[PDB]
């Protein structure tokens, strides 16, 4: 009956049951290990902290992200967070009812194989399914036709869907995302006169980005206005009580989404990638994609991103075109909602992969029955 | 005609004329003020001492370093150093010929703005230019491609340059440097039974490091050797005549460079930082970068630093890679040597910043016409 849905994306992770309209377990996917000896023996403490425990005490712990660029690197550390969400957070054994997994497209083959094996061996879950995060976004918005803009913490990718029939020859994977944006804000904040080199301070930068950063419609014009006015300035409060001043860096960092050359990436900007994806499709359907352009991912929360999105595409696209940008609220969690709706669907129940199929054919079944 | 070059930085400062084979003016950048009441009338001594004057009488003055970690913190005391070197030591008027300055990469923008104002208001120099301390090391070694490690007193930075075109995104800065090593040697010497507390004895600790400290090829086996032998213990003469014996602290102090966990610094080691900087560059250029890795700075004057790094990089880097470490003699003045050669070049006459340019556009011109 019930089905677990867990967003396995980097950074913030979402979890919940099928049919619910909002995830309940939201916590960063960080794991810390202390780098100091414990002089006080009054309590036994722990050698690992996952979730809000690490965020609460990130002063001492050494933060490490198990998922980098939509890739699991440390499998020993990767399994630890799954224990925390199932038992400590959700208080639900994985064996009772199935689980649903999400991942970014164009993932390496070894990632899918070992992820399924962990589900079958450690957690002995009766059945699971791995789905493309961008595909699930279409279900959340209800529409089944259009181009999805998923811009996650690690990977931003595009995939066109026209009344179903996802096109595999037009998918472009770009590694520039919010994680590298924070690293870019790390460097530019040095110029103003603040240093946040350590990993513990790196989480403070993300908080600043999520609060003050905004997207400017015209990058060149706002440079002149900010250089001769303090109106664009806004203050902030650090945990230690100090106050910092943010000038042109407020909008320079979010603007890097359209100029990857600022980060040294040879790849073209995300607005050009979206235009390029439609070009690979046939001319008969190109008119449809412009009408339905949904936005997903945490890095879409910057104010004015939708207005900037439609301005760039209008330039590349010919005249008399319907440039419509769909940016519904909650799109940061849109992938979770799409998975919840799909799991609640009765037709999809026959599409699960069961344990008996795995034992007979091995983990390779993830590439034949699972898509 | 000949242009002055001053590699202003924490610790010793080198000043000299263009085309000179070695800086003629070397002295610690120390400004001190007495902490006792004057009792002798007719003594004639001033109330501020810099350079060699403070070093000779360091038992009374409260020494203060104007430059910390590469950023000037006290412009009042800082300006005295510049006034002293031009007049009392170099015996030349700065307003006749251009002056060349150096600074570390990734510095606060306010630092450069005030540096320009002092040149064009206090001294009124006809021309001035500020150059990155990293790029100057290539000219000293007569190379165009490679990475440098200008491990100075305040900041350690690595900049990969491939036949010019210095990559901005791959520039790595680490706060660990020679000055922080002295503070560690201050604490570790307390265990043996020697205590140094005031700033006056901090200079004494520095002299001990320059004469005895060295880097061992291996760390774990080195401690075993000192446990069952006394051959590694060397005697030293204190200024007051006392005799101090250095135990295993001879090699433990320089080891903090490769294991920042000794100081509690979460950042990676000095050898890991260079590996991180190389990986940021493109694959097609990594072959050249591995071969050409020249060093610099006084913090790399420890014997055995060349062999230890090569072992660390070789284990980290893939095999069958021509890992060559270039540590030629005189490299302690590598930054100044390159500046003298580069200033004498006829092409430098085009990108000088003249007083007319500063007047028409203010101090902000240094961020546009100068790198």
């Amino acid at each position: 009956i019930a089905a677990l849905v867990v967003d396995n994306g980097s950074g913030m992770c979402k979890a919940g049951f099928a049919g619910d309209d909002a995830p309940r377990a939201v916590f960063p996917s960080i794991v810390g290990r202390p780098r100091h000896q414990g002089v006080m023996v009054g309590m036994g403490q722990k050698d690992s902290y996952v979730g809000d425990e690490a965020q609460s005490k990130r002063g001492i712990l050494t933060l490490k992200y198990p998922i980098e660029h939509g890739i699991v690197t440390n499998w020993d550390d990767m399994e630890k967070i799954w224990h925390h969400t199932f038992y400590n957070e959700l208080r639900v054994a994985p064996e009772e009812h199935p689980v649903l997994l999400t991942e970014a497209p164009l993932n390496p083959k070894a990632n899918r194989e070992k992820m399924t094996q962990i589900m079958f061996e450690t957690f002995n879950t009766p059945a699971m399914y791995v789905a493309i995060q961008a595909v699930l976004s279409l279900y959340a918005s209800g529409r089944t036709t259009g181009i999805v803009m998923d811009s996650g913490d690690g990977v931003t990718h595009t995939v066109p869907i026209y009344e179903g029939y996802a096109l595999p020859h037009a998918i472009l994977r770009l590694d520039l995302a919010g994680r590298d944006l924070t690293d870019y804000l790390m460097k530019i904040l040095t110029e103003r006169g603040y240093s946040f080199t350590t990993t513990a301070e790196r989480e403070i930068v993300r908080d600043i980005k999520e609060k003050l950063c905004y997207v400017a419609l015209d990058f060149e014009q706002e440079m002149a206005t900010a250089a001769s006015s303090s109106s664009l300035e806004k203050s902030y409060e650090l945990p230690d009580g100090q106050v910092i001043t943010i000038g042109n860096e407020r909008f320079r960092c979010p603007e890097a989404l359209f100029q990857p050359s600022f980060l040294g990436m040879e790849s073209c900007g995300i607005h050009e990638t979206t235009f390029n994806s439609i070009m690979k499709c046939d001319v008969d359907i190109r008119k449809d994609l412009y009408a339905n352009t949904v936005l997903s991912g945490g890095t879409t929360m910057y104010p004015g991103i939708a207005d900037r999105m439609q301005k760039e595409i209008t330039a590349l696209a010919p005249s008399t075109m319907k440039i419509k940008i769909i940016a519904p609220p909650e799109r940061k969690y849109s992938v979770w909602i799409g998975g919840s709706i799909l799991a609640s669907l009765s037709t999809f129940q026959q599409m699960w992969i069961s344990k008996q199929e795995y034992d007979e054919s091995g983990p390779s079944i993830v590439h034949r029955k699972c898509f | 005609i000949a242009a002055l070059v001053v590699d202003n930085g924490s610790g010793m400062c080198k000043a000299g004329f263009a085309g000179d084979d070695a800086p003629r003016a070397v002295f610690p950048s120390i400004v001190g003020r007495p902490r006792h009441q004057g009792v002798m009338v007719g003594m004639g001594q001033k109330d501020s001492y810099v350079g060699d004057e403070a070093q000779s009488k360091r038992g009374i003055l409260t020494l203060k370093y104007p430059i910390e970690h590469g950023i000037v913190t006290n412009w009042d005391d800082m300006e005295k150093i510049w006034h002293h070197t031009f007049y009392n030591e170099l015996r030349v008027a700065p307003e006749e010929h251009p002056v060349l300055l150096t600074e570390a990469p990734l510095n606060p923008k306010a630092n450069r703005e005030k540096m320009t104002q002092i040149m064009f208001e206090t001294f009124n120099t006809p021309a001035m230019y500020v150059a990155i301390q990293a790029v100057l090391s290539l000219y000293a070694s007569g190379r165009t491609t490679g990475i440098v490690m200008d491990s100075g007193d305040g900041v350690t930075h690595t900049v990969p340059i491939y036949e010019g075109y210095a990559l901005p995104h791959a520039i790595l800065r680490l706060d660990l440097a020679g000055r922080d090593l002295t503070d560690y040697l201050m604490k570790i010497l307390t265990e043996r039974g020697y205590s140094f507390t005031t700033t006056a004895e901090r200079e004494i600790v520095r002299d001990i490091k320059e004469k005895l400290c060295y880097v061992a090829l291996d760390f774990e086996q080195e401690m075993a050797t000192a446990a069952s032998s006394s051959s590694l213990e060397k005697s030293y003469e204190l200024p007051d005549g006392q005799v101090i014996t250095i135990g295993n602290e001879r090699f433990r102090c320089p080891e903090a460079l490769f294991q920042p966990s000794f100081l509690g610094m979460e950042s990676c080691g000095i050898h890991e930082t260079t590996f991180n900087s190389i990986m940021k560059c493109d694959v097609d250029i990594r072959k050249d970068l591995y071969a050409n890795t020249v060093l610099s700075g006084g913090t790399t004057m420890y014997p055995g630093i060349a062999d230890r790094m090569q072992k660390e990089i070789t284990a980290l880097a893939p095999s069958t890679m021509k890992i060559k470490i270039i540590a030629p003699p005189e490299r302690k003045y590598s930054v100044w040597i390159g500046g003298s050669i580069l200033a004498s070049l006829s092409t430098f006459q085009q990108m000088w910043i003249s007083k007319q340019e500063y007047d028409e556009s203010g101090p902000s011109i240094v961020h546009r016409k100068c790198f």
Binding site: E68, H69 | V283
Partner: peptide, 7 residues
Amino acid sequence: WXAXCPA
């Protein structure tokens, strides 16, 4: 990853 990016 296994070549290009740091992963």
